[PDB]
Structure 1
Amino acid sequence: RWVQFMKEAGQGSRDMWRAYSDMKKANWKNSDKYFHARGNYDAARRGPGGAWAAKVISDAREAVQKFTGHGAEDSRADQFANEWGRSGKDPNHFRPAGLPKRY
């Protein structure tokens, strides 16, 4: 169903929001790739709709970041982490040392 896909998309959107919210609450140096990967990883594991939402949201954020002057290298690196998580690879490969266990 389109309904089931959309439900997955809604949940994946929530996952993406949580990664952003946790990133902000954590204030941890060089943690953004971890949180980029984690949100995409969580969302894609909701199902196809979740993977779709993760991609659509990732792509919008990359666009807004570019507009603000984010460098091409940093954007590419962020997109690498996004796709890493979304494909099911462990977000913890981007985990900075000492990031609290709750994240």
Structure 2
Amino acid sequence: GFFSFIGEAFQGAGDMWRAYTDMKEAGWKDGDKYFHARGNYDAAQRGPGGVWAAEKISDARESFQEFFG
């Protein structure tokens, strides 16, 4: 299939964005995650804009444009 992972402007302990496929007779274990933040300024911020998730985009003409200032 199509697997896509996009992530921007973020903070995490871990175990993120994974894609396990077609496994047979498997087994695993994952730990505990801790996230501690104290007294931080301006964290995990993203600017203006749009998100588009599309399986098929066909015959677009003069489309999907963005004009910032």
TM-score with structure 1 length normalisation? 0.17
TM-score with structure 2 length normalisation? 0.21
Structure with bigger strand share is: 2
Structure with bigger helix share is: 1
